[PDB]
Design a protein around this ligand. Structure first.
Ligand SMILES: *[C@@H]1O[C@H](CO)[C@@H](O[C@@H]2O[C@H](CO)[C@@H](O[C@@H]3O[C@H](CO)[C@@H](O)[C@H](O)[C@@H]3O)[C@H](O)[C@H]2NC(C)=O)[C@H](O)[C@H]1NC(C)=O
Ligand SMILES: *[C@@H]1O[C@H](CO)[C@@H](O[C@@H]2O[C@H](CO)[C@@H](O)[C@H](O)[C@H]2NC(C)=O)[C@H](O)[C@H]1NC(C)=O
Ligand SMILES: *[C@@H]1O[C@H](CO)[C@@H](O)[C@H](O)[C@H]1NC(C)=O
Ligand SMILES: *[C@@H]1O[C@H](CO)[C@@H](O)[C@H](O)[C@H]1NC(C)=O
Lengths: 35, 49, 35
C-alpha cells in the first residue's frame, strides 16, 4: 500500500544467535543419531 | 548542576557527561559526544576565543 | 575511545532463555545420551 517502498532483507538479531544453538542442538542430535 | 538548579534543588553532574543530555534533546544520540569528546572541546575552546 | 568507561557485565534477556532451556535440553540430552 505504501508508495516508494523497496525490497531488502531485515537482519534478525535473534535467528543467528538461535541458529548458533541450532548449530549445537542439531549437531548434538547428529552426535547421537550416527553412533 | 546542568539545568536542574532552576527547577528545584541544585544537583551536581559532570560537565563532560552533561552534553549527552543536551545532544540527546537535539535529536542526536549520545554516542557522538564521547567519541568526539576531544574534538568537540577544541571547537568550543576556539569559538569562545 | 570513550573516556571514563568502566568494566561491568550486562544480563541479556536471552541468558535465561539458554540457562533454563539448554541445560534442561542438556539434561534431556543426558536423559537421552546416557541410556
Ligand atoms: C576491563 O577489562 C579488560 C579485559 O577484561 C581490560 O583490558 C585489559 O587491560 C590490561 C591492563 O591491565 C591489558 O594488559 C596489557 O597488555 C599489554 C599487551 O597487550 C601490555 O603491554 C600491558 O603492559 C598490559 O599488561 C590487556 O591487554 C587488556 N585486554 C585486552 C584484550 O587488550 C581493561 O583494562 C579493564 N578496564 C578496567 C577499567 O577495569
Ligand atoms: C519486491 O519483491 C517481491 C518478491 O520478491 C516482488 O513481488 C513480486 O512481483 C512480481 C512482479 O514483477 C510478481 O509477478 C510476483 O508475483 C510478486 N511476488 C509475490 C510473492 O507476490 C515485488 O514486486 C518487489 N518490489 C519491488 C519494488 O521491487
Ligand atoms: C557428543 O557426545 C559425547 C557424549 O558421548 C560428548 O562427550 C561430546 O562432547 C559430544 N560432542 C560435542 C561436540 O560436544
Ligand atoms: C527422560 O526421557 C523419558 C523418555 O524419553 C521420559 O519418560 C522421562 O520423563 C525423561 N526424564 C526427564 C527427567 O525428563
Amino acid at each position: 500500500v505504501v508508495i516508494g517502498i523497496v525490497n531488502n532483507t531485515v537482519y534478525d538479531p535473534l535467528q543467528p544467535e538461535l541458529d548458533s544453538f541450532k548449530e549445537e542442538l542439531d549437531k548434538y542430535f547428529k552426535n547421537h543419531t550416527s553412533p | 548542576s546542568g539545568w536542574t538548579f532552576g527547577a528545584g534543588a541544585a544537583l551536581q553532574i559532570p560537565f563532560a557527561m552533561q552534553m549527552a543530555y543536551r545532544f540527546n534533546g537535539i535529536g542526536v544520540t549520545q554516542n557522538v559526544l564521547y567519541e568526539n569528546q576531544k574534538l568537540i572541546a577544541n571547537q568550543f575552546n576556539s569559538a569562545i576565543g
